[PDB]
Amino acid sequence: GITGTWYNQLGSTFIVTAGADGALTGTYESAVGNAESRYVLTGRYDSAPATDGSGTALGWTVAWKNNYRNAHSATTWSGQYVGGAEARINTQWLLTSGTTEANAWKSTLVGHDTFTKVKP
Amino acid sequence: GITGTWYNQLGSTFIVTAGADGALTGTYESAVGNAESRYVLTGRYDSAPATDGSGTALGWTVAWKNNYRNAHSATTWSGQYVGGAEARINTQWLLTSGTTEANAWKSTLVGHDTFTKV
Amino acid sequence: GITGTWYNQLGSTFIVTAGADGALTGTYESAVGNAESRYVLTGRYDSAPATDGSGTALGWTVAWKNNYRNAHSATTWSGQYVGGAEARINTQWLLTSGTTEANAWKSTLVGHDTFTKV
Amino acid sequence: GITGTWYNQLGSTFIVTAGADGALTGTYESAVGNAESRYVLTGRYDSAPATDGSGTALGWTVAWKNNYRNAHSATTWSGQYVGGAEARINTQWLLTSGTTEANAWKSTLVGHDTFTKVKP
Ligand SMILES: O=C(CCCC[C@@H]1SC[C@@H]2NC(=O)N[C@@H]21)NCCNC(=O)c1c(-c2ccccc2)cccc1-c1ccccc1
Ligand SMILES: O=C(CCCC[C@@H]1SC[C@@H]2NC(=O)N[C@@H]21)NCCNC(=O)c1c(-c2ccccc2)cccc1-c1ccccc1
Ligand SMILES: O=C(CCCC[C@@H]1SC[C@@H]2NC(=O)N[C@@H]21)NCCNC(=O)c1c(-c2ccccc2)cccc1-c1ccccc1
Numbered sequence: 001g002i003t004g005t006w007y008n009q010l011g012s013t014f015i016v017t018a019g020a021d022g023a024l025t026g027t028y029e030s031a032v033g034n035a036e037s038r039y040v041l042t043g044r045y046d047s048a049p050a051t052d053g054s055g056t057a058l059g060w061t062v063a064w065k066n067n068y069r070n071a072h073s074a075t076t077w078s079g080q081y082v083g084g085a086e087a088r089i090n091t092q093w094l095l096t097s098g099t100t101e102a103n104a105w106k107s108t109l110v111g112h113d114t115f116t117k118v119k120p
Numbered sequence: 121g122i123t124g125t126w127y128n129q130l131g132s133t134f135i136v137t138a139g140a141d142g143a144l145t146g147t148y149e150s151a152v153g154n155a156e157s158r159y160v161l162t163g164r165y166d167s168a169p170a171t172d173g174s175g176t177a178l179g180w181t182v183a184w185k186n187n188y189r190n191a192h193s194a195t196t197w198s199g200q201y202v203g204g205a206e207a208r209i210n211t212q213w214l215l216t217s218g219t220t221e222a223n224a225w226k227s228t229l230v231g232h233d234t235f236t237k238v
Numbered sequence: 239g240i241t242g243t244w245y246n247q248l249g250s251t252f253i254v255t256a257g258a259d260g261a262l263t264g265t266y267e268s269a270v271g272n273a274e275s276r277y278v279l280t281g282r283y284d285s286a287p288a289t290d291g292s293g294t295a296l297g298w299t300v301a302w303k304n305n306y307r308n309a310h311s312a313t314t315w316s317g318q319y320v321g322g323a324e325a326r327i328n329t330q331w332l333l334t335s336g337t338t339e340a341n342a343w344k345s346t347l348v349g350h351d352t353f354t355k356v
Numbered sequence: 357g358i359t360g361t362w363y364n365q366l367g368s369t370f371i372v373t374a375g376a377d378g379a380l381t382g383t384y385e386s387a388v389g390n391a392e393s394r395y396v397l398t399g400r401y402d403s404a405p406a407t408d409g410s411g412t413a414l415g416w417t418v419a420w421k422n423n424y425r426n427a428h429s430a431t432t433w434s435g436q437y438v439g440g441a442e443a444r445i446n447t448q449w450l451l452t453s454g455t456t457e458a459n460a461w462k463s464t465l466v467g468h469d470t471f472t473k474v475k476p
């Protein structure tokens with residue numbers, strides 16, 4: 001299932017609990033960027049996915065403020081969980097920083113992360 | 121600041137409460153798509169933003185399942201709150217549906233919404 | 239239709255000619271970023287679009303090198319032309335810079351531009 | 357170099373010539389979607405990349421009309437070429453379909469493609 005400890009291709013660690021009714025709650029530790037230690041994450045997932053072999057839609061957010069650092073930014077990941085012998089969460093993400101209105105055009109990075117349960 | 125009722129350019133409704141710990145909680149009603157009634161949202165925001173004229177970074181997620189409908193999809197909005205009179209939240213979003221592996225290339229829509237506080 | 243001079247909400251300038259074969263060619267001048275003067279653009283559009291009220295799909299690219307400056311980056315705009323009086327091109331864009339492998343995660347910005355025909 | 361025949365992770369074929377002054381010109385055959393045979397592509401790349409080990413920025417567009425089909429849509433790929441023993445083009449893409457104004461919110465798919473010169 002979705003609940004567990006996941007790692008992306010950068011070595012970031014995503015520890016999450018999937019609640020029965022659709023909540024995602026956990027912590028995220030980024031291997032890159034202006035970040036140290038764990039950050040709070042929350043999100044949602046489809047708690048009754050289709051029964052046709054499709055993945056399970058989900059998303060979550062981290063605001064990059066914790067007890068140690070504040071990067072004045074937030075990332076959201078949107079994607080799907082694909083179960084099986086080697087489960088995956090395939091995502092695309094948007095990282096928005098707080099900017100002035102004049103710099104808003106350069107506020108948001110986009111990328112993609114693949115998560116597996118394999119510890120690097 | 122963030123706490124309140126917001127609408128976007130499609131006529132969708134966002135009711136949110138921003139907690140002291142950086143939490144966002146509330147409900148979302150979409151004017152479009154495979155959606156009816158309110159859906160749970162959850163997210164996070166920068167609870168100690170810069171005071172140099174920058175927006176406040178925030179994001180949230182809605183999974184499009186409630187007790188009335190399930191679209192097997194989820195949207196995340198990533199953006200920033202711009203306060204003052206005429207408060208706005210400017211976002212870009214990703215909407216992913218659950219797909220088979222063969223259809224995964226067409227799983228995700230992208231767009232942008234502007235929210236106005238009422 | 240598409241052929242002409244366009245501006246966006248940032249004050250950038252897009253001069254384009256749409257060819258019978260689906261080609262777009264022209265020049266772009268950005269109001270923002272690491273850019274000065276005109277840059278070559280090239281792209282494609284649907285030269286036989288639907289006539290049922292749909293926009294006309296199109297995209298183009300600018301690499302941010304000209305004979306005056308090089309920002310080691312490139313933007314692509316993907317969107318659709320909506321004709322008539324008050325013609326518009328509504329787009330979303332991806333701006334990728336050349337990076338080292340360690341910095342690749344932060345290579346690409348995303349945004350949206352609306353162009354108005356003059 | 358960039359000039360050559362590339363394949364993505366779906367098995368699509370990207371045949372391109374990189375002109376000396378920044379042009380990309382070629383053809384694209386998609387393994388998926390409403391597509392058959394080759395489609396014209398054009399784009400641009402940085403014809404004088406940095407000399408610090410960075411990739412080469414580039415982008416290109418395909419409108420999905422050819423002699424056989426018209427899907428009333430266009431894809432742009434934005435990314436970078438990374439040379440070496442196993443050269444790659446790493447991209448993110450936007451696929452916009454012509455829609456009514458009311459359906460514009462659902463006009464654009466986003467994804468990512470990785471290209472290599474290895475024929476599947
Ligand atoms: O670095 C972070 C937090 C960690 C992000 C980690 C990302 S989440 C998507 C991806 N997946 C993963 O596991 N890790 C990465 N936030 C960006 C904060 N922005 C700046 O510091 C900044 C930047 C910038 C932007 C992106 C990446 C690196 C640097 C550039 C210019 C200005 C700023 C800036 C300055 C003042 C206030 C706010 C932002
Ligand atoms: O419609 C929704 C839920 C509501 C989204 C509203 C969006 S959120 C971003 C934006 N902002 C806002 O306020 N409203 C919109 N989700 C997409 C569900 N997808 C499908 O049913 C689907 C579609 C499709 C695409 C767009 C709109 C409607 C339907 C196309 C092909 C296949 C599917 C599909 C089939 C089976 C299972 C899952 C998806
Ligand atoms: O500024 C440009 C060229 C002009 C883009 C204009 C954009 S196109 C989408 C939008 N629409 C429009 O009309 N104008 C804007 N390219 C980015 C170059 N990147 C860097 O120099 C860079 C940056 C950065 C990010 C945003 C703006 C300015 C600079 C941040 C970190 C590192 C780099 C960097 C360093 C070395 C080599 C390449 C990139």
Ligand SMILES: O=C(CCCC[C@@H]1SC[C@@H]2NC(=O)N[C@@H]21)NCCNC(=O)c1c(-c2ccccc2)cccc1-c1ccccc1
Nearest residue numbers: 226368386387388389390391420427428429431449451453
């Ligand atoms: O399928 C294509 C062309 C081929 C795209 C291949 C993509 S390019 C990004 C990726 N990389 C790659 O190598 N292959 C894929 N265009 C989409 C045309 N849209 C529709 O037919 C359509 C769809 C839809 C959207 C995306 C994918 C599949 C289907 C859904 C609803 C309505 C339409 C539609 C109807 C009438 C007119 C236009 C669009």
